[PDB]
Amino acid sequence: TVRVAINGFGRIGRNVVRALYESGRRAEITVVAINELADAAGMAHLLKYDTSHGRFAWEVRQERDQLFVGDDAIRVLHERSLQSLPWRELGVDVVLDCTGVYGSREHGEAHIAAGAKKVLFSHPGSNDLDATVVYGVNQDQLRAEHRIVSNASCTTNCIIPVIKLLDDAYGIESGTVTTIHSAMHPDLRRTRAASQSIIPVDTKLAAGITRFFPQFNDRFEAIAVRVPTINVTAIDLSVTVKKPVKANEVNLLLQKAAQGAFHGIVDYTELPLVSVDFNHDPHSAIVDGTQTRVSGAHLIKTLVWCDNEWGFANRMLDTTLAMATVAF
Amino acid sequence: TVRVAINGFGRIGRNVVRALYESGRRAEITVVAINELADAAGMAHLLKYDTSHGRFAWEVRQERDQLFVGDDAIRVLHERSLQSLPWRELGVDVVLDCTGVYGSREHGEAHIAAGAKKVLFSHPGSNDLDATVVYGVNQDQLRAEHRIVSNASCTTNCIIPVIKLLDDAYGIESGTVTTIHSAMAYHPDLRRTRAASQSIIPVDTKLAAGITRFFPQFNDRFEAIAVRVPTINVTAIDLSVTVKKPVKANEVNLLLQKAAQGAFHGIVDYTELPLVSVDFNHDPHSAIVDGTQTRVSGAHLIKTLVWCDNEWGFANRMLDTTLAMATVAF
Amino acid sequence: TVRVAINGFGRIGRNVVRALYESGRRAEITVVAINELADAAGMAHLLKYDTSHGRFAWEVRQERDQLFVGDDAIRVLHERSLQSLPWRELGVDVVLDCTGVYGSREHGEAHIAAGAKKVLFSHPGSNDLDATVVYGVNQDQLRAEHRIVSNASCTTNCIIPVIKLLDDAYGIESGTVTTIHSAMDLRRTRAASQSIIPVDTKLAAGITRFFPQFNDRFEAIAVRVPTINVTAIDLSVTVKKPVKANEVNLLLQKAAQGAFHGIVDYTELPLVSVDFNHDPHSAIVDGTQTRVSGAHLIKTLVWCDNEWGFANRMLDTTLAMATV
Amino acid sequence: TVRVAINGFGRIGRNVVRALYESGRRAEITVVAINELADAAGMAHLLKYDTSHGRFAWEVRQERDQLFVGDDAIRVLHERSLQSLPWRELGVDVVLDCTGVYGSREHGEAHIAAGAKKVLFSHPGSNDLDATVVYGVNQDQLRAEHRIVSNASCTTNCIIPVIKLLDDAYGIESGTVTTIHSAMHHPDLRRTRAASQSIIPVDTKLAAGITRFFPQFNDRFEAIAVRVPTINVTAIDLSVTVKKPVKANEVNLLLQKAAQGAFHGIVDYTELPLVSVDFNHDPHSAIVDGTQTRVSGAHLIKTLVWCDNEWGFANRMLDTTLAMATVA
């Protein structure tokens, strides 16, 4: 088994754990430790009861510095100092660092100093790492020597595979995206009741895209709003393409990719569905074919769904396996 | 005083009335009659309470066959045949048809035959009316012989003025729009039965065909989708267009900002404040450009996010259009 | 195997099918037919996709006037009159009439006449049926010759067991209830405002019908709030015997452990309404909220997934009816 | 004119100012000064824009240390030290302290020593202030010798007048209350959980507040509360046992009459079929919903009570303020 440690037990951290068990990936991966600067009581409770995902099916037990999920024992640490973590003693193959705040070499190297073989960040970090993976797109670029890696971000994993598919088919020359987020300072917007408004929020989506697709620097922008719905995101993508195209052809391309090389990663639907119907859906992206439009023959719009959190947590596990099982 | 009658007292009919008093337009226009099918105890209560900006500030009551707003008496009518509406007896200058159902030349003629000089429809109607007005964009296209006019639609009015501004400055080549609508058993459209509170729900939208009617040149160059989210009374419109001329986000904002100071004052507003949607609740502008959200990808793909209280701006535009029709008039 | 047909494929009828498969009761009940006025594609669709209960696990296909759940075929009918339902041909043991509109003795008689052996109504219905069952409280009042039975109402089901527990231990003198409803006609014409909306409720009438000694001693009100489909029931009773709040919690905790296990649950954990979504208990007593004013006025807060709990009790009462 | 200063410009302090301008009380009360740590530009923006109460009808400008409401200039302070507040300079007759921090006899003494003649706190406070006033019920218990006064709390202000009314008519023996809060505000494990889906139990000091005010109901009153995702209007579900025998129509008639007479402008009564937003920005402390009144047997009364907790409370602060500067 690949022995994994979770640094930080916020929403992504807890989701990685549930997804490990629910997906059957536990036959190949085991979680041996979680570091979180909060009490084990609350951790265990929040792991068992989720608003967005419901009741977790495995017995959850907490005792001393141990968290139990079914039979598995899991050490709970409260360390402010990354180098003082017991990674070597626990035989840590991969630390999944889910703390948020940027990722980087210094931090990865501190997990490695404590004795972890590799590090996978949940957040894009800086342009300094051994690699950034959008699983389903570029995991075959990983090498045995890539030890400090980033899995991109919740929102980037949703849209990148779609962008890849459209650009391969038609050549993207320009792109603009709006993300409609579900519910989840020097900004007079935070101190406003989320219950009733469409609230614009900061987004780093564009940076994510142009870092992954450097041929689009100065060619991509993004905005975002928050709305009071349940954990499903809609990404509204508008791209100009080189080759002329019609909507039913954009749709055929995406249907077949979901059928084929992107099965499990990008799904496609034509059914009359609403966002909750993708709650807890493990795909990175579900293209809603009913919303595909082409203006003229060069301006594509697609509406893409994702459970950004559940999709991403599953990909985190996919990337962890790819990292842990590569030959030099 | 411009004599008006309102046919249909649903959300829009009621908002037209509220707008008339709140805006001061009542110095210019008097509502002589309201035609509504369905009890009138309702009418008063809904006028009073279903408002969204506090209880309507004018005193409201229902006596006899009459509705009282403040000290004004309005004749309440219940008539199913357009032919027998007593517009002639009341000397009605414009009938504001707010039913959401009547929209054809023949419906127009039917109102005019019962004695209205002119008719204004609260929705796009048929493709062959005398004119379709987006107040602030093309009221000047109203001739004297145009007795049957459409006011376009709530959503259409939000966006066409920004489209005009953008087209004139940079030349729109193609365009795509997403409307984020606020909230309003078994049904053949399967999405409609679903709990609204929980979801982003894709909805059918007529916006593209509205843009297309107004801008003949944009046929086959414009598309639209929409979703409904569980927020209240303010719509956002997410507009992406390719333009001929090379532009930056800052120049697009200056343009729109200057236009809001000048020729679209009172119609299109502009802002750079960190505001949220409820901040435009009961705002009477047709559109509010949110400067902070403006992007240009490359130098030719503009994204603008526009807000509106779709019902409130529309109701106000109905009154504005009324006066212009009355202005140069048959 | 009990052969059941379902009349009305509204939310209730659909949860009855979902629950049938999820609890494993496929082993003792078979659904042989559904009558629904609307078309079978709509039915299959709604069965699969649900805002409250997520994606249904079993494969759902629709094919002509057949509906397929897993390997199972279910005839779909569109009869608007009870007399023409093919209950004889299909050998129906129990109609589960979930329409919310057929509830009288003569509606039961028309189901029987068409060949159904018995009928279980998914609502209080007529006041002159053979029995009204709130499972866990009075299924032992059931008899073989009871042919036209009512299953009470979802909200009645949530609270009646708790009322019985409290009346037995301390003697209820008077009672008053507020139901806080989720996404479940004077005020409907309003616009969207995200409001607490008062709604008419029949809970007082359901409580006194089940406990007639409470006539003129019980009242209830309700509000709708824009939440997910878990109801909170806020029950305030005056009682004869003096009590403290911790005594009340012990009694219900023990009730949950014992005679009401699987019907009433009990929690002292810091939960919120979504934590009871898809819970098949009729009621979950929240101990953290129990209060006693003085020593005689008890307040209890009780949670329920009113739809889910109720659809499972319908199944229980069904089995109890068929293999008597 | 009574000169007043406001200490703390959060939600309550801003609402007092809005309430002042909207009620016409600007003829009797002048706000000479606001002390607030945050920036003036922020104060102005938040005074102008508010999700509950909407766009302030009065112009709002901010320049330097001045906040302009209409054409009234108001002095802004940023002083952490009560001893240094320039009250004497400004001739402050009453400090409305709306910080929700300050609340003790000493804090009161500090304001007075800095030169404010009297003090009104916007909350419970501590158990030894000169008076606690729920305006409409006990403003008669005010004496000129009362210098350090508390206004009670929002919810306590909504329900006390009703309890008074029912106790006076019928003799209340015992009481229990559930408060249905909208989106407003031992580690509470529920506070993580997203407001947008659930009914969420929350701690309440309502009973404490009632006990404090009516110590004869010591051991005779309890309260729970929940939060639901509605906008700014609270429902209070009050269930009391009474000594006298009563009927629901008699209860409603009592309360309707009190609303016509002795509690006019403080308690309102309605028989109309309404919803909670209908009371948004309603200045009464309480609106009894007559459609919802019940009595079980002849002694167990339920009434459902609405209030815009923040707006009624803002208006009461001013009522008390006015009763504190005039004892002549």
What does this structure look like?
Four copies of one chain form a homotetramer. Chain A is an alpha/beta fold. Chain A has eight helices and 18 strands. In chain A, the strands form three sheets. In chain A, strands 5-6-7-2-1-8-9-11-10 form a nine-stranded mixed beta sheet. Chain A has a seven-stranded mixed beta sheet with strand order 13-14-12-15-18-17-16. In chain A, a hairpin with a 2-residue loop joins strand 5 and strand 6. In chain A, helix 1 packs across helix 8 and helix 5 crosses helix 7. Chain A is globular and about 65 Å long. The relative contact order of chain A is 0.15. The interface between A and B is large, with 47 and 50 residues.
Radius of gyration of chain A, rounded?
Answer: 20 Å
CATH topology of the largest domain in chain A: Rossmann fold
Please report which band the strand proportion of chain A falls in: under 5%, 5-15%, 15-25%, 25-35%, 35-45% or over 45%. 25-35%
Greatest interface and its participating residue counts: A-B, 47 and 50 residues
The CATH class label of the largest domain in chain A is Alpha Beta
The CATH homologous superfamily of the largest domain in chain A is called: NAD(P)-binding Rossmann-like Domain
Structural class of the helices, strands and pairings of chain A?
alpha/beta
CATH architecture assignment of the largest domain in chain A: 3-Layer(aba) Sandwich
Extended strand count of chain A: 18
Strand order of the largest sheet of chain A: 5-6-7-2-1-8-9-11-10
Q: Whole-Å distance between the termini of chain A?
A: 19 Å
Helix content estimate of chain A: 25-40%
Keywords (chain A): Cytoplasm, NAD, Oxidoreductase, Pyridoxine biosynthesis
Pathway (chain A): Cofactor biosynthesis; pyridoxine 5'-phosphate biosynthesis; pyridoxine 5'-phosphate from D-erythrose 4-phosphate: step 1/5
Subcellular location (chain A): Cytoplasm
Binding site for substrate (chain A): 153-155, 190, 203-204, 226
